[PDB]
Design a binder for this molecule. Sequence first.
Ligand SMILES: [K+]
Ligand SMILES: [K+]
Ligand SMILES: [K+]
Ligand SMILES: [K+]
Ligand SMILES: [K+]
Ligand SMILES: [K+]
Ligand SMILES: [K+]
Ligand SMILES: [Mg+2]
Ligand SMILES: [Mg+2]
Ligand SMILES: [Mg+2]
Ligand SMILES: [Mg+2]
Ligand SMILES: [Mg+2]
Ligand SMILES: [Mg+2]
Ligand SMILES: [Mg+2]
Ligand SMILES: [Mg+2]
Ligand SMILES: [Mg+2]
Ligand SMILES: [Mg+2]
Ligand SMILES: [Mg+2]
Ligand SMILES: [Mg+2]
Ligand SMILES: [Mg+2]
Ligand SMILES: [Mg+2]
Ligand SMILES: [Mg+2]
Ligand SMILES: [Mg+2]
Ligand SMILES: [Mg+2]
Ligand SMILES: [Mg+2]
Ligand SMILES: [Mg+2]
Ligand SMILES: [Mg+2]
Ligand SMILES: [Mg+2]
Ligand SMILES: [Mg+2]
Ligand SMILES: [Mg+2]
Ligand SMILES: [Mg+2]
Ligand SMILES: [Mg+2]
Ligand SMILES: [Mg+2]
Ligand SMILES: [Mg+2]
Ligand SMILES: [Mg+2]
Ligand SMILES: [Mg+2]
Ligand SMILES: [Mg+2]
Ligand SMILES: [Mg+2]
Ligand SMILES: [Mg+2]
Ligand SMILES: [Mg+2]
Ligand SMILES: [Mg+2]
Ligand code: NA
Ligand code: NA
Ligand code: NA
Ligand code: NA
Ligand code: NA
Ligand code: NA
Ligand code: NA
Ligand code: NA
Ligand code: NA
Lengths: 67, 157, 97
Amino acid sequence: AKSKNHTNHNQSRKNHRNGIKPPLPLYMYNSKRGGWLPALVNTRRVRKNNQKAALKARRERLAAHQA
Amino acid sequence: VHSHGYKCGTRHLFAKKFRKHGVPSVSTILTNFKVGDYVDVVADAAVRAGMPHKYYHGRTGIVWNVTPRGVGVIINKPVRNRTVRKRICVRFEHVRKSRCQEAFKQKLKDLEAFRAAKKAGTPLPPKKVSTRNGGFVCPKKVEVLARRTADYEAMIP
Amino acid sequence: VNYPKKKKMHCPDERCNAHKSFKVVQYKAGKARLYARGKRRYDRKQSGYGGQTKPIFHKKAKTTKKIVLKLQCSNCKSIIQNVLKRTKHFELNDKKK
RNA sequence: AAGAGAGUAGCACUGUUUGGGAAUGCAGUGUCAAGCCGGCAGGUAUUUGUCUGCCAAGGUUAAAUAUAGAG
RNA sequence: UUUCUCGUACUGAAAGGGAGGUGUGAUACACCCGUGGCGUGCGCAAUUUUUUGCCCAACACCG
RNA sequence: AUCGAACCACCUAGUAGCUGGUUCACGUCGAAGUUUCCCUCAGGAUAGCUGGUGCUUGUCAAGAAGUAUUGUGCGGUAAAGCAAAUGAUUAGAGGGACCUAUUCUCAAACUUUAAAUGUGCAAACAACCCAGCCUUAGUUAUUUUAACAAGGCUUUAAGAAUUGAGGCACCAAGUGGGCCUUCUUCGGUAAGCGGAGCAGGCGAUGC
RNA sequence: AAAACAUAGGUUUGUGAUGCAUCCAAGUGGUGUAUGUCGCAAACUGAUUUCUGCCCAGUGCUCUGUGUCAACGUGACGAGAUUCACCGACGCGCGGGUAAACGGCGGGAGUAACUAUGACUCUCUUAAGGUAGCCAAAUGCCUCGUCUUCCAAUUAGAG
RNA sequence: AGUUUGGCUGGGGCGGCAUAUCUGUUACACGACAACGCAGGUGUCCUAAGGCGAGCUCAGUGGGAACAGAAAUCUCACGUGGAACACAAGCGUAAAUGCUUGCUUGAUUAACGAUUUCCAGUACGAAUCGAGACUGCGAAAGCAAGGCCAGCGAUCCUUUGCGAAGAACAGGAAAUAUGAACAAAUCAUACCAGAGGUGUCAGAAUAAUUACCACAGGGAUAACUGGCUUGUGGCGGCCAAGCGUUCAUAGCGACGUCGCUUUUUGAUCCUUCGAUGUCGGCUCUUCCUAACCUAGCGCCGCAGAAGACGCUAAGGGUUGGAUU
RNA sequence: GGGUACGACCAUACUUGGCCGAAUGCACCAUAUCCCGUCCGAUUUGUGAAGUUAAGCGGCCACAGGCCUCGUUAGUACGGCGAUCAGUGAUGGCGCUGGAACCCGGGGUGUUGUACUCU
RNA sequence: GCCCGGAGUCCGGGCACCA
Ligand SMILES: [K+]
Ligand SMILES: [K+]
Ligand SMILES: [K+]
Ligand SMILES: [K+]
Ligand SMILES: [K+]
Ligand SMILES: [K+]
Ligand SMILES: [K+]
Ligand SMILES: [Mg+2]
Ligand SMILES: [Mg+2]
Ligand SMILES: [Mg+2]
Ligand SMILES: [Mg+2]
Ligand SMILES: [Mg+2]
Ligand SMILES: [Mg+2]
Ligand SMILES: [Mg+2]
Ligand SMILES: [Mg+2]
Ligand SMILES: [Mg+2]
Ligand SMILES: [Mg+2]
Ligand SMILES: [Mg+2]
Ligand SMILES: [Mg+2]
Ligand SMILES: [Mg+2]
Ligand SMILES: [Mg+2]
Ligand SMILES: [Mg+2]
Ligand SMILES: [Mg+2]
Ligand SMILES: [Mg+2]
Ligand SMILES: [Mg+2]
Ligand SMILES: [Mg+2]
Ligand SMILES: [Mg+2]
Ligand SMILES: [Mg+2]
Ligand SMILES: [Mg+2]
Ligand SMILES: [Mg+2]
Ligand SMILES: [Mg+2]
Ligand SMILES: [Mg+2]
Ligand SMILES: [Mg+2]
Ligand SMILES: [Mg+2]
Ligand SMILES: [Mg+2]
Ligand SMILES: [Mg+2]
Ligand SMILES: [Mg+2]
Ligand SMILES: [Mg+2]
Ligand SMILES: [Mg+2]
Ligand SMILES: [Mg+2]
Ligand SMILES: [Mg+2]
Ligand code: NA
Ligand code: NA
Ligand code: NA
Ligand code: NA
Ligand code: NA
Ligand code: NA
Ligand code: NA
Ligand code: NA
Ligand code: NA
């Protein structure tokens, strides 16, 4: 008793029932884990300095307000 | 027996054009790439190293990583009822800079020049006029077309 | 295939940390130990009246085996194992054409 | 001043049983102890030295427990 | 403050070990009304016919 | 009245991917016969199609669209050619083979050329410019580049779209024998035959 | 209901009793055996008549002097578990016998005064190459074989 | 005594492998697509046939030289690759990816970096882009961690390598851990990386027969009728090279070509497996016409007789026996 | 109007033949002590100026081939969507629309960047 | 795989099999 082997019938209609979802936006899931290491290490050092400057700025803004 | 190897249908896809064989030229070597650029992925077929899979031939995407002899590109691909962002690694010979945004950038520059001219008082170029309106048509002579019965004898081989 | 009897290779040991001369020997499995844990359990399970308690695998299909080489450093006598592709005939000559 | 249960305990082979795993308990046969530096146990096998707890191979004994086709 | 159990701490095969912030220096030192930083963020507060602040929950990225 | 393993009671309500059955009403929604793996092919697991519960929000539209336009990439089918390479092939002519230029007729596993229908990307705010500024163990002979930031400036005619709620979860059912048709298409003399592609139907539905 | 079984006739095998065949969970247990080779147990063929050919390479059964095969023993290294060495039977291999044990028992060329046929020759090959007999037979595919007889005519019957 | 005795499949069996896999085409110019569709491959081979530098140009053709000729070696010119690149095919390549030669071991290690192909966006195989060690070839830029894309394998179990020696008043940046009452030496185990294999290739340990046969089911599936088709079987047309003393067509008609029928046999598997009684003969009725006899006609190579061909016409008739 | 060195695009630049070429330069050219390499200083390597535009090179020409471009082939071949369209069929035209290829004809035969330089 | 015997080693034997 043989039977069908393969078909793609009705598959396109099923996929469009809930539609082809759009791709994720460019600003999400944008890590660079597997990238070129020498540039990644340099960026980490700059990011650490930037965080230190951000903390100091809020300290100065608050102290100015308390006057 | 079709077989599903890495290049299972690429007889005409991965072939060079007529009288255009050879290896990449110098201008291709000095291209330079930056993260965030738009590139087209096209196989060269003369450089076997770092060739992308046949699906990604003729696809456009954004580069996310640069290595000494390679470029990483993000490309959309639809699977079932969704689309996946795939990351592929290719050699620099198989990528070209994309001109898919040059019309948009030119429009922005024109608008900026419009503002500068208005604020500097510079006269503006005159507006183009559509030809879909009416008008007078005065012809020197009028011809006729009436199926002159020589065409009927003409379409006989 | 033919393999040289000696070759120059990198020794990762802190004593060498350079390219040294290595001697080549072919790997052969050791003799199965009585009183190994798996053998002790198998012997306990086999005693009695049950019969044969585990499969025996008669359906062999391959005709070759992978080649493993034991490379011994000239100094520090450390051993590194390497794997070659399967061949029907293997020999060491250390003599070219 | 003495003593405290011998084909007994242990060991080997075989079989069975157990969660018990280089062998938890038991049975058959062979072999078969110690006690002027004793014996058994202490969950990985062997030899040696300490430490801890107990002292088999004879016997009786209420209550708290069961009544899953009884009286 | 139960006598047992689940949870407030996890990690390694195991021996074992075990998580706050800011500032200053290269079991370090001094403080404790306190979101590690950045991005998007209900509502409330403040300006003027719009802009800004705090941002809760949640998500992404880097320590 | 029982024999290619008697009869009686018990283990025994033995197991069955297989056949049969499975008891009130109305309402809101509503399918699949396809993918991968399995001693798998009358069965399962897995993704897809569906229902329920929502969460975070918005209210004209964010990460919207089985549709256009503009710009910019991809292609070797239909057609065409053999007076162009590869393969097949007919006949005269000019200097029996041979040479030169032609000539009849061809190709799913030939091709210089090459459509229609297709297919990727872009068409703004988590953004782009302009200016000055900080940091780095990145690059460079140094500047200059690369990357992360911080305080100010600007920005929502030419056929020149138009439609509108965005995003994110948890739990679970049935199904996993399909069949028909316009057009494209392989095997077969053919078949109400066997097997595929895009789309629409029946199955589940009457009028 | 037979062409099957049995039968008388024929042949073969084991066996002298502490035996051969054999029941049985077991014993100073049981059967042929209250028996003793003109006996008992186990096979095959199937009255009488006339006969019973060749093959021991295969498988089986059976009879005689050193490779391999287990425990138990005897020695060693080691502190000991562990390990090593030597010894080690029937059987299997070697060497004989056996077909009224299971069974088996050939191809291809040439050649005689008309053609035909082939007494004769050559060749390859086996453990042996189907002998005496019998046949389109309940055994012959081709096949309703070919000839004679029986009939007017016979895929039937007989020779 | 117990158990087993693959699967797919135009029924099943025998055959084959479409059972794990590579190339071209079917495939309809993105990607994807079936059949026991077409044409072919794979379980290997290589210390060089791997790596790099340098030099060179291949297949073939034409003109020349004792033996020497169509074909031996030398020389000049042309030569877009028509050669070669282990093997199947496709792609690719000319101061090279080809050939010769020189030197070598990037076929090593590579902190669990990221990714592609199949795809559930799992594993396995193969491949791509990186970072660190030590190197090879180069004057250098640079190239190379195999031979480009096919050539291979889970849990459990066995087995090998690494955890050298010393240094630290204490387990630390840097000393592998355990054998649970504790010490000395053996033995065993654990953590990391390989190897011994499952070809039914996501991986059970496996011989037959049943006509003495059994059960659960299946029209998801064969053996009758019926249905679609008509290759094969049967019955006919059209054209006209020839046969007919001459004369294509009285009667025939080759080489070709167009049909009809369902009285043969195939092809298929739609209905029936909680059953539609399966060859032949006997008996009886009816229908069809492609007309054997009976009625009436045309035509002939129809003198008569007997016949050949054709038309209307199915009212009526169509036997007795031997063998099976 | 030019030369040389290094290039970009890679035939409008290639192939064949003919003619001409002021200067700077580029070449052909002389020779093997040393560096170096070959069967052979042919190529390659090291050192000079004796000759010459012969060749290479540049420029121009050819009813020259090829190549590039524009027309023509032609709204032809082919195509998407539609019909209770035509036709026994094989196939075909129609409506709304997209649109080729060779042959053939006209034209053309490199553009250009950096530095040192000659008239 | 073990024991051999006959040729650094290929054959013939008698045994033994948890990926
Ligand atoms: K005892
Ligand atoms: K399923
Ligand atoms: K009878
Ligand atoms: K009778
Ligand atoms: K009778
Ligand atoms: K008898
Ligand atoms: K007789
Ligand atoms: Mg192409
Ligand atoms: Mg006592
Ligand atoms: Mg008592
Ligand atoms: Mg029940
Ligand atoms: Mg039912
Ligand atoms: Mg509804
Ligand atoms: Mg399996
Ligand atoms: Mg194609
Ligand atoms: Mg065509
Ligand atoms: Mg399911
Ligand atoms: Mg249904
Ligand atoms: Mg309807
Ligand atoms: Mg009767
Ligand atoms: Mg007789
Ligand atoms: Mg007789
Ligand atoms: Mg015999
Ligand atoms: Mg027989
Ligand atoms: Mg004889
Ligand atoms: Mg006969
Ligand atoms: Mg007969
Ligand atoms: Mg008769
Ligand atoms: Mg007779
Ligand atoms: Mg397509
Ligand atoms: Mg395609
Ligand atoms: Mg080279
Ligand atoms: Mg490979
Ligand atoms: Mg490296
Ligand atoms: Mg490679
Ligand atoms: Mg019978
Ligand atoms: Mg059916
Ligand atoms: Mg019925
Ligand atoms: Mg009935
Ligand atoms: Mg009936
Ligand atoms: Mg319609
Ligand atoms: Na199916
Ligand atoms: Na069913
Ligand atoms: Na008889
Ligand atoms: Na014999
Ligand atoms: Na005879
Ligand atoms: Na007869
Ligand atoms: Na089957
Ligand atoms: Na027919
Ligand atoms: Na008639």
